[PDB]
Design a protein around this ligand. Sequence first.
Ligand SMILES: *[C@@H]1O[C@H](CO)[C@@H](O[C@@H]2O[C@H](CO)[C@@H](O[C@@H]3O[C@H](CO)[C@@H](O)[C@H](O[C@H]4O[C@H](CO)[C@@H](O)[C@H](O)[C@@H]4O)[C@@H]3O)[C@H](O)[C@H]2NC(C)=O)[C@H](O)[C@H]1NC(C)=O
Ligand SMILES: *[C@@H]1O[C@H](CO)[C@@H](O[C@@H]2O[C@H](CO)[C@@H](O[C@@H]3O[C@H](CO)[C@@H](O)[C@H](O[C@H]4O[C@H](CO)[C@@H](O)[C@H](O)[C@@H]4O)[C@@H]3O)[C@H](O)[C@H]2NC(C)=O)[C@H](O)[C@H]1NC(C)=O
Ligand SMILES: Nc1nc2ncc(CNc3ccc(C(=O)N[C@@H](CCC(=O)N[C@@H](CCC(=O)N[C@@H](CCC(=O)O)C(=O)O)C(=O)O)C(=O)O)cc3)nc2c(=O)[nH]1
Ligand SMILES: Nc1nc2ncc(CNc3ccc(C(=O)N[C@@H](CCC(=O)N[C@@H](CCC(=O)N[C@@H](CCC(=O)O)C(=O)O)C(=O)O)C(=O)O)cc3)nc2c(=O)[nH]1
Ligand SMILES: *[C@@H]1O[C@H](CO)[C@@H](O[C@@H]2O[C@H](CO)[C@@H](O)[C@H](O)[C@H]2NC(C)=O)[C@H](O)[C@H]1NC(C)=O
Ligand SMILES: *[C@@H]1O[C@H](CO)[C@@H](O[C@@H]2O[C@H](CO)[C@@H](O)[C@H](O)[C@H]2NC(C)=O)[C@H](O)[C@H]1NC(C)=O
Ligand SMILES: *[C@@H]1O[C@H](CO)[C@@H](O[C@@H]2O[C@H](CO)[C@@H](O)[C@H](O)[C@H]2NC(C)=O)[C@H](O)[C@H]1NC(C)=O
Ligand SMILES: *[C@@H]1O[C@H](CO)[C@@H](O[C@@H]2O[C@H](CO)[C@@H](O)[C@H](O)[C@H]2NC(C)=O)[C@H](O)[C@H]1NC(C)=O
Ligand SMILES: *[C@@H]1O[C@H](CO)[C@@H](O[C@@H]2O[C@H](CO)[C@@H](O)[C@H](O)[C@H]2NC(C)=O)[C@H](O)[C@H]1NC(C)=O
Ligand SMILES: *[C@@H]1O[C@H](CO)[C@@H](O[C@@H]2O[C@H](CO)[C@@H](O)[C@H](O)[C@H]2NC(C)=O)[C@H](O)[C@H]1NC(C)=O
Ligand SMILES: *[C@@H]1O[C@H](CO)[C@@H](O)[C@H](O)[C@H]1NC(C)=O
Ligand SMILES: *[C@@H]1O[C@H](CO)[C@@H](O)[C@H](O)[C@H]1NC(C)=O
Ligand SMILES: *[C@@H]1O[C@H](CO)[C@@H](O)[C@H](O)[C@H]1NC(C)=O
Ligand SMILES: *[C@@H]1O[C@H](CO)[C@@H](O)[C@H](O)[C@H]1NC(C)=O
Ligand SMILES: *[C@@H]1O[C@H](CO)[C@@H](O)[C@H](O)[C@H]1NC(C)=O
Ligand SMILES: *[C@@H]1O[C@H](CO)[C@@H](O)[C@H](O)[C@H]1NC(C)=O
Ligand SMILES: [Ca+2]
Ligand SMILES: [Ca+2]
Ligand SMILES: [Cl-]
Ligand SMILES: [Cl-]
Ligand SMILES: [Zn+2]
Ligand SMILES: [Zn+2]
Ligand SMILES: [Zn+2]
Ligand SMILES: [Zn+2]
Lengths: 693, 693
Amino acid sequence: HNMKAFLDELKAENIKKFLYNFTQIPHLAGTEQNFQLAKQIQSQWKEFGLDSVELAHYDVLLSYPNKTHPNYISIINEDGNEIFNTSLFEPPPPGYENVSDIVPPFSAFSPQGMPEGDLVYVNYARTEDFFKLERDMKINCSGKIVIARYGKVFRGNKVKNAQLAGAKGVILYSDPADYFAPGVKSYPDGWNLPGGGVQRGNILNLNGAGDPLTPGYPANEYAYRRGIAEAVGLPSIPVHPIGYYDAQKLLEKMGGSAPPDSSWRGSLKVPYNVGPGFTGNFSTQKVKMHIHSTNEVTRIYNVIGTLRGAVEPDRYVILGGHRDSWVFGGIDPQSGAAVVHEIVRSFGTLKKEGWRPRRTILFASWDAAEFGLLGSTEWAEENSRLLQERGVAYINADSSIEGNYTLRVDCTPLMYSLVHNLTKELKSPDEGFEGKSLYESWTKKSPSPEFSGMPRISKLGSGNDFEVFFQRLGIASGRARYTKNWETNKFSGYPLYHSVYETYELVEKFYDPMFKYHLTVAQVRGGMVFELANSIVLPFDCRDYAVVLRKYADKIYSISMKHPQEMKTYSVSFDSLFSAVKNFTEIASKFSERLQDFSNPIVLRMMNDQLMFLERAFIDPLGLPDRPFYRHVIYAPSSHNKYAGESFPGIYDALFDIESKVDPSKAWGEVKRQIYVAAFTVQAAAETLSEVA
Amino acid sequence: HNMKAFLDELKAENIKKFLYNFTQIPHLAGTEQNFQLAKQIQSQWKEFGLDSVELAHYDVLLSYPNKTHPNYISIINEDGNEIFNTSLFEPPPPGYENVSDIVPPFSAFSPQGMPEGDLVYVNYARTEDFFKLERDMKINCSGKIVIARYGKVFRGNKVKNAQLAGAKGVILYSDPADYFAPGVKSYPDGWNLPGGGVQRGNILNLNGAGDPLTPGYPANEYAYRRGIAEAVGLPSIPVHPIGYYDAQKLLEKMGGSAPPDSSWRGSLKVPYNVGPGFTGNFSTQKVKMHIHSTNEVTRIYNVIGTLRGAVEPDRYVILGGHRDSWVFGGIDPQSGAAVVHEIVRSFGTLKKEGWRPRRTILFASWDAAEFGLLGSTEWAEENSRLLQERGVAYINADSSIEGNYTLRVDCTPLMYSLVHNLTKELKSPDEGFEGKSLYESWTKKSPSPEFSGMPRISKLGSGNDFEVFFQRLGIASGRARYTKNWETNKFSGYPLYHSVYETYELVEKFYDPMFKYHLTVAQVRGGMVFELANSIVLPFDCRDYAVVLRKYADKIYSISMKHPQEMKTYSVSFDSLFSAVKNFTEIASKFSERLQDFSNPIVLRMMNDQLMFLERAFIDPLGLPDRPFYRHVIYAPSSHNKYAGESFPGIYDALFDIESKVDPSKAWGEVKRQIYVAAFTVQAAAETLSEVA
Ligand SMILES: *[C@@H]1O[C@H](CO)[C@@H](O[C@@H]2O[C@H](CO)[C@@H](O[C@@H]3O[C@H](CO)[C@@H](O)[C@H](O[C@H]4O[C@H](CO)[C@@H](O)[C@H](O)[C@@H]4O)[C@@H]3O)[C@H](O)[C@H]2NC(C)=O)[C@H](O)[C@H]1NC(C)=O
Ligand SMILES: *[C@@H]1O[C@H](CO)[C@@H](O[C@@H]2O[C@H](CO)[C@@H](O[C@@H]3O[C@H](CO)[C@@H](O)[C@H](O[C@H]4O[C@H](CO)[C@@H](O)[C@H](O)[C@@H]4O)[C@@H]3O)[C@H](O)[C@H]2NC(C)=O)[C@H](O)[C@H]1NC(C)=O
Ligand SMILES: Nc1nc2ncc(CNc3ccc(C(=O)N[C@@H](CCC(=O)N[C@@H](CCC(=O)N[C@@H](CCC(=O)O)C(=O)O)C(=O)O)C(=O)O)cc3)nc2c(=O)[nH]1
Ligand SMILES: Nc1nc2ncc(CNc3ccc(C(=O)N[C@@H](CCC(=O)N[C@@H](CCC(=O)N[C@@H](CCC(=O)O)C(=O)O)C(=O)O)C(=O)O)cc3)nc2c(=O)[nH]1
Ligand SMILES: *[C@@H]1O[C@H](CO)[C@@H](O[C@@H]2O[C@H](CO)[C@@H](O)[C@H](O)[C@H]2NC(C)=O)[C@H](O)[C@H]1NC(C)=O
Ligand SMILES: *[C@@H]1O[C@H](CO)[C@@H](O[C@@H]2O[C@H](CO)[C@@H](O)[C@H](O)[C@H]2NC(C)=O)[C@H](O)[C@H]1NC(C)=O
Ligand SMILES: *[C@@H]1O[C@H](CO)[C@@H](O[C@@H]2O[C@H](CO)[C@@H](O)[C@H](O)[C@H]2NC(C)=O)[C@H](O)[C@H]1NC(C)=O
Ligand SMILES: *[C@@H]1O[C@H](CO)[C@@H](O[C@@H]2O[C@H](CO)[C@@H](O)[C@H](O)[C@H]2NC(C)=O)[C@H](O)[C@H]1NC(C)=O
Ligand SMILES: *[C@@H]1O[C@H](CO)[C@@H](O[C@@H]2O[C@H](CO)[C@@H](O)[C@H](O)[C@H]2NC(C)=O)[C@H](O)[C@H]1NC(C)=O
Ligand SMILES: *[C@@H]1O[C@H](CO)[C@@H](O[C@@H]2O[C@H](CO)[C@@H](O)[C@H](O)[C@H]2NC(C)=O)[C@H](O)[C@H]1NC(C)=O
Ligand SMILES: *[C@@H]1O[C@H](CO)[C@@H](O)[C@H](O)[C@H]1NC(C)=O
Ligand SMILES: *[C@@H]1O[C@H](CO)[C@@H](O)[C@H](O)[C@H]1NC(C)=O
Ligand SMILES: *[C@@H]1O[C@H](CO)[C@@H](O)[C@H](O)[C@H]1NC(C)=O
Ligand SMILES: *[C@@H]1O[C@H](CO)[C@@H](O)[C@H](O)[C@H]1NC(C)=O
Ligand SMILES: *[C@@H]1O[C@H](CO)[C@@H](O)[C@H](O)[C@H]1NC(C)=O
Ligand SMILES: *[C@@H]1O[C@H](CO)[C@@H](O)[C@H](O)[C@H]1NC(C)=O
Ligand SMILES: [Ca+2]
Ligand SMILES: [Ca+2]
Ligand SMILES: [Cl-]
Ligand SMILES: [Cl-]
Ligand SMILES: [Zn+2]
Ligand SMILES: [Zn+2]
Ligand SMILES: [Zn+2]
Ligand SMILES: [Zn+2]
């Protein structure tokens, strides 16, 4: 009973069977189908040998289209005749044309409305796209309907940016430039997005809050709920997503200004004119949205499985991923959930033979992730005191594959050495690397930009269920999956993301026919959990944090140094931050020596608690400015793109666009304040590794 | 080497010697004398045998009178002639008439100004006094100078209440009704306040913030400071304290309305007319303040002593009390500091013979407590991550005596059983109880109102250095001292509080000539620290929390039930809170059985961590409404009197004066929200005591 016994028990054929099982019908959050799947998972986890398996339910704000009053968009003429209508549903894939309960495409949490107006095209609707429009092109989005292509940033940020530019509605679409890889066929004949395909997804800006109605507290049976007008993160203008056949019909008539440059042009045979409005002949025509979706408080269910630790049952290593899907969830999330299921089964086989992990392992099937990470966040709000004092690590397990090229890992620096060592012990599943380690194939295909002979590991961003554990609670977190070649593939994520076409067949035929990539991912996620839960000394290397802190401090300093006159005028010094980083490096190095050099379980557990609380020490209980649920001072989701991680976010946001601020004294004061906060937090985290007395 | 060896080493004669030593010259915060005393304490603590003794310094906002432009108050005639002036200093006591550097009476943090106006007398300036004036008497304080007698509530609350009533200045005075006990002589011939005596003290409303300039973060050498206009807690109108000879001259001419009733009348031979202004003959005369005090960032120094634990060096038991005084600090704080000094000496004698406590003991000499608990709060802000994860308990040690009648203890319910058991083992120092236990004399003199054969133990309020540890950080805290008979003595605290007359002689001649009460207090505080630091199982009884939670829930429910119609209309139910309290009781009882029933140090330490984190579980990281540094959901300082503890403060404040709110729907919504928060927090704390997996 060692890690190799655990790894060897995992089977590609089991993951395949589970994935097929989890993807035959839709499992939309808050629906009966998804409750039944929760009960099935609960039952099988018990069968598999877990000590306890419970449902934790919450009543949270969800959003659904109105079944009898469909959402759509029109081009309307001067008389008010609707001369073109967008689709009411995606053409269903072969053999699913009689599946019921496929939710039509919609933007979850859109308010109702029927705004009518002239179009402005805003590229990806990024902060810089709006800068370019308003500041350089002098185009005013006020009272216009904005059309934006999906890609580059989280769609919630797009909607916020449009709303702040004064738009009265947003139309999101998938451009073939971003969702149709050259030389591959459309689904069902290949893995590309067809013209009728549409990407679902919520457009909230929760900033870590969880259920919009109950920020701070679990949405239990006696919860006090905010009124809708005070809910967190809801958009104020209607929003709806469409495919590129429909987008072409909306864009082909566009007039006004030419696109400023080629980075504004997608692949449709249209000019990509910014607008506002249509060219000469069609200038009396307008665009009309019809959105009738409703928000409603709906019950959701997490499955929580427990495998009690033999020696430290009060230390938790968590493996969690969501179970709710937009439609069939062939990739997102069931390719991850099938892997979690096999990992539980494997741990349970060992448990039936008398083994227990040293520490407790918790397994989670989260609900309502698609609606804003609601299930994981409510559960963590409920259990925050247990998680704060006992949480060793959180390993996420959403989509196992988004490509077939190489490994992708995003994690805290505390897990870098764990990940390097583990991948050196795993077999590469890649063609041309048979008999070579996963470390070797991963390092060759995705070299670290900083270090020779190391692989790339990215910062954690957000848009997934580790968010509450890492950026709210300060629990060391990581995730891993197979991914595409990010050098040669210029499209975003995978084309069929959140569309009806994301099916079991998509995975089995095009992504992973042997289920070898899924198996590799099961080994990486499961092996990380195994080492975290069983290693005598927690497998965290604090010296890896010291190295990245220096890199982030150099980076934030170089950003500020674009304004040398203001740094002089306002006496802006990074000296304290570099001093704190230097101290962290020195103290971490001394702690590592002590960790090498001690039969005494109090010293050990004292040392394991210093390792466990180190991530915790980066939490500021006052949170970041106007984002009280982002409390980690080193990492937060980018204020311009929730998916991307930003380092020293408090300083970054204080410097961002600072040359445009009206009161430079005040703005540079706030930069200095954020420098102080970061230097202090780094020094305080360093001091948790000093001798305790 | 056991507790009895520790207790027996403590000597009344040593405490006397130390008190004499600490009270020969003033030790005002931020002055050179107080820095020299810090260095002396540091040196002696090292001599006494502590492992490490360091100064932790901070640069915080303090306040001082202007040496060359004295504060005073006048009655000014129509021509602007100042016909009466209040005193420039208290007549110094016998033999101290040539002591330099006695700070004259002043209100620390008063802004500058010379407002001129008509007087209104506002009794104790309590919330209910202002209600009575504005609502019942229809007296308008707007643009008036308010004169208030000290007593009943913290003077900071008085100033806030006056400021919100629209006053343009506040004059505080000591009425003989509150500071002159019948049949006792004035200092130097007895322990009463003379007519020339004046009570110093700050008038901030920090609500737990610490240094007004750096809320959240220690005021270290690179701290970003708020501007003064954004500082926390500063009063907006000038304020100055006077004695009763001067008060009589201000009050004797008062006209306008009669006092509403006898509870408004003190003991001066004046009518206690409310005003506004003076009677007929003197109605053209006005009162003029002259305040020239300045706020300035000033260095302060805590002494931090460490006695490393032999077995759990990463668990901290803290004994802390302040060292800064208004003048000589005969009682406040040096009667406490002399006791701490003897406790350190005693622990050090054991340490020199080879003993170490099981857990680490930290000893603190805090600075600038008189200016808003600044030294303890900055240090705790600096070390918050260590204290959060490792802090077992905080025992305070300010004034050891405020009377000679019986023991007074205020503490978390987690320490009730500890205090009962320890006092049963200590000798009573009281006349008539020779050979009887302190428990027996204390229980006879100060019976618990709830239980036969138990003594009274009060809730922790605030106004002392446990505040950051308990209501911000959630570390189990307690305090103990000798006190007066609260049934027969209707005056407040002790008469000479914060006056020049609070000297070594006051204590030696009138309060405790044998130093037997000081010795008893040293035994209670030292014994509590000894048991907390050495007992194998932490000496906390979670079942005592279950009992008081029920009492507080009954109390808050009965307050709400004064509005049965609104409870019906708005569907206000306490069901969830009573359910959470019931669950807490059941789970606590099961935890206690497990604590009785387990050679296994992981179980033990797991159980000790459940005991240690139980106080911690009552912390809400979002804080109470508009008081982010009061995070404890069961206890906060009363919003009307910082000194008094309030239970379920979030609910209490939501119900307070609710019948006057303009939007009852909104106000009752907030009551329900606070009920949810409290029920949730109680249930969550309960669940930290459940089996961990
Ligand atoms: C990284 O770690 C180092 C420890 O190796 C730590 O060094 C500390 O730096 C502070 C800030 O400079 C030092 O503060 C000084 O303390 C002495 C007393 O020991 C004071 O007399 C000094 O104050 C005078 O000088 C100031 C600066 O010119 C004046 O502004 C002031 O008005 C006084 O005249 C000063 O406060 C401290 O001594 C060291 N501690 C050591 C060396 O042990 C450093 O701060 C850490 N970095 C961070 C970001 O925490
Ligand atoms: C104190 O401890 C007890 C545990 O002994 C704990 O009991 C729990 O109470 C909740 C709240 O009532 C129960 O919630 C129910 O759960 C079931 C599934 O097990 C649901 O079907 C129920 O929902 C239906 O009924 C509701 C009430 O009428 C409807 O509003 C709702 O729409 C549904 O139709 C309901 O949610 C829970 O089962 C128990 N847990 C137990 C008994 O183990 C209690 O909550 C604790 N107190 C506090 C303040 O936490
Ligand atoms: N120069 C260079 N750089 C590289 N960077 C990276 C890599 C390999 N690693 C990565 C890391 C991230 C990415 C990437 O696609 N990032 C996107 C984010 C995509 C993402 O994280 N999506 C989420 C979506 C999950 C989802 O559906 N969540 C819901 C709910 C979200 C919410 O409510 O919060 C939703 O979005 O609707 C996910 O897959 O986890 C971005 O930062 O903009 C790609 C490759 N390789 C390279 C490289 O070879 N060269
Ligand atoms: N029915 C009944 N009730 C009883 N209640 C209690 C007792 C014995 N216990 C107590 C408990 C509290 C008190 C009391 O005097 N309470 C005062 C508060 C006095 C106080 O705590 N003062 C502080 C002042 C410390 C100080 O100088 N601090 C600075 C800084 C404060 C800041 O900035 O926060 C200042 O105030 O200026 C202290 O002594 O600790 C109040 O609640 O209004 C008296 C007796 N006995 C009885 C009893 O026999 N019968
Ligand atoms: C997915 O697998 C589960 C588990 O085998 C199937 O659920 C079982 O179905 C059988 C036959 O109907 C029942 O006797 C069991 O009671 C079910 N067990 C459970 C829920 O634990 C389920 O049918 C499969 N789903 C699909 C779509 O193939
Ligand atoms: C787009 O959809 C609308 C709504 O179904 C169509 O307009 C309706 O047509 C019927 C019958 O012709 C009328 O009686 C309704 O009053 C119309 N509703 C509205 C809102 O105009 C419209 O024909 C469709 N357009 C196209 C080109 O298919
Ligand atoms: C990853 O593997 C390396 C290589 O084995 C581990 O580093 C060694 O650890 C042992 C045990 O403490 C030391 O005696 C060696 O000197 C270390 N070798 C080094 C630093 O080259 C490392 O600890 C592993 N990391 C984790 C998190 O397990
Ligand atoms: C209080 O006691 C201390 C400690 O005995 C005295 O400080 C010492 O004074 C002697 C004689 O001046 C010196 O030789 C020592 O260096 C001092 N020791 C210290 C500071 O640790 C102090 O004089 C006493 N103060 C009063 C007012 O009596
Ligand atoms: C109260 O104090 C003031 C200030 O010291 C006294 O008034 C001053 O008197 C001198 C000399 O008589 C004048 O030249 C100053 O201009 C006065 N200053 C002010 C502000 O009026 C005043 O006499 C004192 N009153 C009493 C009764 O002692
Ligand atoms: C206070 O003293 C009581 C009386 O000795 C302690 O309660 C006893 O503790 C022992 C040891 O666990 C039990 O076997 C007895 O049954 C307990 N007696 C009781 C409850 O009457 C109590 O634990 C002490 N409290 C603290 C905090 O030390
Ligand atoms: C769905 O739409 C219809 C309008 O045709 C409306 O009457 C019904 O109430 C709607 N259902 C909702 C809003 O839940
Ligand atoms: C955009 O246009 C409208 C005028 O129709 C105006 O009210 C609005 O303020 C303009 N916005 C900007 C940012 O110039
Ligand atoms: C799988 O790998 C092959 C070979 O590199 C590639 O051509 C194909 O596009 C990949 N499939 C997917 C879905 O990425
Ligand atoms: C003290 O008061 C005098 C006025 O007589 C003033 O000139 C001096 O600056 C003051 N000191 C201060 C404000 O610190
Ligand atoms: C008190 O009096 C003044 C009029 O001199 C007025 O401005 C103020 O609003 C009054 N305040 C109240 C509370 O009635
Ligand atoms: C000390 O005790 C005696 C006897 O009860 C009492 O008369 C005296 O007032 C007390 N002194 C003080 C300062 O409380
Ligand atoms: Ca919530
Ligand atoms: Ca501070
Ligand atoms: Cl993932
Ligand atoms: Cl005290
Ligand atoms: Zn997902
Ligand atoms: Zn998704
Ligand atoms: Zn004091
Ligand atoms: Zn005091």
